[PDB]
Symmetry: D3
Subunit: 150 residues, 6 copies
C-alpha cells in the first residue's frame, strides 16, 4: 500500500538544462522517498525496452536516439499512490497542455523535449524499475515518516 | 465584501515539517492580509469543537488526538473571497488528488497528514475564528492595499 | 509554427508590487524566448487601443486610467503555441478563480488588479505587438534551443 | 545546550511588505524550532521597554513611534547558538552593508526599515522573550531532532 | 538621497541562460526601483564606449565582440546607495571568488561569462545610463516607498 | 582546465531532511556538471577509507557509524575550480559559523549534522571519486557550455 514504487527519469533535455535538482526536490517535498538513484547514458536496448509499447509508432525511432543521446538521471520513489501522483506532478503528454505547477507545465513546450518520463501504472512501474535498477541498488527497510503517514 | 475572513491552521504535521513559513508566504503573496496569528497546543475540547461536524465519524477520534498531539499555528486571513480561495490554494481533502501548485498537492500524500486545515464556508469561518481567537487578538482597521484592491 | 509570438504586459499593480522578475522568470523557465522588452508609462491612446474591444464596457474607463497610472513592463515572447500557453500560465479573468500555480492564481484577488495582461489569440497578439513595439525593437534571427525544440 | 532561545520580531515594515512567511521559513530551514509566535500591535510601554537600551538616542522617539505604528509578528526560536546565528542570518545594522543571503541584505536599504529585529545576546533574549511572551504562550516540551542534533 | 541610480546589464550569457527574471527580482526584493528597462543587441560603438576604461586590455576586443554577440537587457535602478549595493549583490570580478548569495557566486564560474555587469561608481553610472538610455526612456516621477524609506 | 572534478556527498541527515534536490540544483545553477551520481548505504570500509584522515579522532568511530547509518547520495561535479568553489558553497566546518547563502549556513546547526561533505583538494577529490565511483559510472564525454565558458 504505502510501499508502492514508481520509476522516474530526467530525460536528456532535462539533464542538459540543469533541472535535475528541481525535479528531485519536488518529489522530496511531496513526501515520496527516493529508493533508487543514478545517472547514466541509456543504451539503445534500454531505450527500446523502456518504450517497447511504442515500437510501432512513427516517432519511436526519434525517441530512442534522443533518450540515448545524453546522460539521464533515473529515480525510484516510494509512497502511497506514488505512481498516479507522480504523473499528476509531471503533467500530461503535451507540455503546452500541462498545467502550471506541473513539471512539463512550468518547463516544457515540445512533446519531444518532455523533460521527465515516468511510469503510467503499477504494472509498468514494476517493469521499468526492474529494467533500470538491479535489486541491490534499491533501499530495503524503508520506515514510514510519522509526519507523512498516519 | 473585501473584509471577509477565513481561519487557517497549520496542522501538527505541518509544523513538525517546518512548513509554517512556506504556507504563510503563499497567502501573503496572494494578497490576503494576516489579521490573527499564534502557535499553541490545541486542547481536546478545541479539537472536537473545530471538527464537531465530524463527531460521529469513525476517524474523528484519531483526528482529535492528532490535532492535539503537537503545536499548531493558527491564522486568520482577510480579503475578497478569501474563504473559497484559501480552499483552492489548499487543494482538496485527499492530498494525492490535490493538484500541483496547491499546498497539499505539493506537500501531502495522506489524508491524516493534510498539513493545513481551513474553513469551508463563511459560516464555518466566523465560527472557527471566534473559536480560536479572542476579539482583541485580531486587527481592526485594516486598510485595503491600493495595489491589491480597486 | 515555433516562431509564434505573444504580447505580455506587467500591469501597473504588478510593477508596483515588484513582481516583474517573477513573471519574466516564469516565462523563461517555460522555454519561451523574450524577443521584445521595455518599461514605459502607457499613454491614454495606447491604453484604449490595446483594449479597444472593450470600449463600450462600463469599466473600460476605469481600466484605461489605471493602465496609464504608472509604469508598465511590456514583453514579447516567442515559442510553440506561446499565445494560449501564456494565457494558461496567467490564469483566467478572475484572479480568485485562477488556479494555484498560475500568475493571477498565486498573486491576485481583484479583476481590476490582474497583475499581468496578455494576448488571447494570434490575431490579437500580432495587433498588440505591432501596437506596443516597433519592428527594430524585436529580435530577428532567433535560433531554436536544441534542448527545447525537437 | 541546544535549548538556547532568542527573540525575533519582524518590524511593521516587514509585515507590510508581506515578508513574514519568507522570514519564518529561513529559520525553519536552519533547523531552529519556533517555540512562540503571535501577531500584535506593540504598546508604547512595550516598545520603550524593548529598546530602552537606546533611551538616549535622537532617534529613540522615532523608533518607538514606528514600532507601535502597525502590527508586528513576535517569534521565539530555540536551538544551538540560535542567538548569534539568528543575528548572522539577519545581517548587520545597515541593510546596505548587510550581505546577500542575509534578510536585510536581500530585502532592506534603510536602517529605519530594517525588516526584522533580534536579540543580540542570551541575556537580552531572556529579557525580550519574558517581555513579549507570557510563559503560557511558550512551548514547554523542547524536543530535539536527530537529523539536526547528534 | 534615495534618488541615486546605477546601470545594470545582464550580459549575453545571462540572457541565454534565462537568468533575466531571476536577476531583476533580486533587485526588486531589495527595494530598488526599476526606472529604465529594455532589450537590445549592443553596437560596437556602444560596447566600446561602455568599457572604454579597458581599451588597453589584451582581452578588450574579446569582451566587445562578446557583448555585441547577442541580446542584452539593460536596466536602471534607483535607491539609497544602489550603486555600491548593486555591486555587492553582483559579487566580485571572479565568479568563483564571488560568495554564495551573490549573482555571480550562485550562477557563474568564468570571468568571461560574468552574467551581469554594473556601474562601479555614481560617476560611472551617470555616464553609463546616459550612454544606454535616452531621457525619455527613464522614469521621471521618482516616488519613495514608506515601508522602504522613513 | 575546466575539467577539474570534486566529490560531493550529502550525508544521511541531508537525505533524511529531503535536501538532496535542493543541493544538486545549487551546483547546477553555478554551471557545474554532474558527471556521476547514485544513492547507496556506505560500508564501514568505505566510510573508514573516506575519512581515514581523521583515524586519530575521538569522534572518528562516531562519524563512521553515522555515515553508514543511512542512505547517502554521492555526486561528482566537474568545472573550473569546482573543488574550492564547492567548498565555498558548502560553508565551513561549523554550520553555525557558515554564512547565509551557503548550504550549512542555511540548513545546519550541528557539526555532526553537517548535511553535505566535500573534497577539500584536487588530490583528495581524485582519491574520493575513485573510492566512491567506478570508472564506468563516470561521464566520459566532458562537454563545455559556451554560455558558461569562453
Ligand atoms: B506517449 P508517451 O509515453 O510518450 C513517450 C515519448 O514518445 C515521444 N513522442 C510521443 C508522442 C505521443 C508524439 O506525438 N511524439 C513523440 O515524439 C516523446 C515522449 N515523451 N513524452 N512525454 O507519453 P508520457 O507517458 O507522457 O511520457 P513517458 O512518461 O516518457 O512515457
Ligand atoms: B473532511 P474534512 O474536514 O477532514 C477533516 C479531517 O478528518 C480526518 N479524516 C477525514 C477523512 C475524510 C478521512 O477519510 N479520514 C480522516 O482521518 C483528517 C482531516 N484533514 N483533512 N483534510 O476535510 P477538509 O475540509 O479538507 O479538511 P479541514 O480543512 O481540516 O476541515
Ligand atoms: B476581459 P479582459 O480582457 O479584461 C481586461 C481588463 O478589463 C478590466 N475589467 C474586466 C472585467 C471583465 C470586469 O468585470 N471589470 C474590469 O475592470 C480589468 C481587466 N484585466 N484583466 N484581466 O480579460 P483578460 O483577457 O483576462 O485580461 P487582459 O489580458 O488584460 O486582456
Ligand atoms: B542599533 P540597533 O539596535 O537599532 C535598533 C533600531 O533603531 C533604529 N535606528 C538605529 C540607529 C542606530 C540609527 O541611527 N537610527 C535608527 O533609526 C532602527 C533600528 N533597526 N535596525 N537595524 O540595531 P540592531 O540591533 O541591528 O537591530 P534591532 O534588532 O532592531 O535592535
Ligand atoms: B574588470 P571588469 O570591469 O571586467 C569587465 C569584463 O571584462 C572581461 N574580462 C575582464 C578581465 C579583467 C579579464 O581578465 N578578462 C576578461 O575577459 C569580462 C568582464 N566581466 N566581469 N566580471 O569587471 P567588473 O567591473 O566586475 O564587471 P563589469 O561590470 O562587467 O565591468
Ligand atoms: B573536519 P571535517 O573533515 O569533519 C568531517 C566530519 O567529522 C565530524 N566531526 C568533525 C569534527 C572536527 C568534530 O569535532 N566532530 C565531528 O563529529 C562531522 C564532520 N562534518 N562536518 N562539517 O570537516 P569538513 O571537511 O568541513 O567536512 P567533510 O567534507 O564532512 O569532511
Ligand atoms: Mg509513457
Ligand atoms: Mg473540513
Ligand atoms: Mg483581454
Ligand atoms: Mg538591537
Ligand atoms: Mg567594470
Ligand atoms: Mg573534510
Amino acid at each position: 500500500v504505502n510501499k508502492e514504487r514508481t520509476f522516474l527519469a530526467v530525460k536528456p533535455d532535462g539533464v542538459a538544462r540543469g533541472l535535475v535538482g528541481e525535479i528531485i526536490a519536488r518529489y522530496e517535498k511531496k513526501g515520496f522517498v527516493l529508493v533508487g538513484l543514478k545517472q547514466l547514458v541509456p543504451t539503445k536496448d534500454l531505450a527500446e525496452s523502456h518504450y517497447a509499447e511504442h515500437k510501432e509508432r512513427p516517432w519511436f525511432g526519434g525517441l530512442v536516439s534522443f533518450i540515448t543521446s545524453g546522460p539521464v538521471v533515473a529515480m525510484v520513489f516510494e509512497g502511497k499512490g506514488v505512481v498516479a501522483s507522480a504523473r499528476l506532478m509531471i503533467g500530461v503528454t503535451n507540455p503546452l497542455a500541462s498545467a502550471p505547477g506541473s513539471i512539463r507545465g512550468d518547463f516544457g513546450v515540445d512533446v519531444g523535449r518532455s523533460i521527465i518520463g515516468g511510469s503510467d501504472s503499477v504494472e509498468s512501474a514494476n517493469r521499468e524499475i526492474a529494467l533500470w535498477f538491479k535489486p541491490e541498488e534499491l533501499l530495503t527497510e524503508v520506515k514510514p515518516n510519522p509526519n507523512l503517514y498516519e
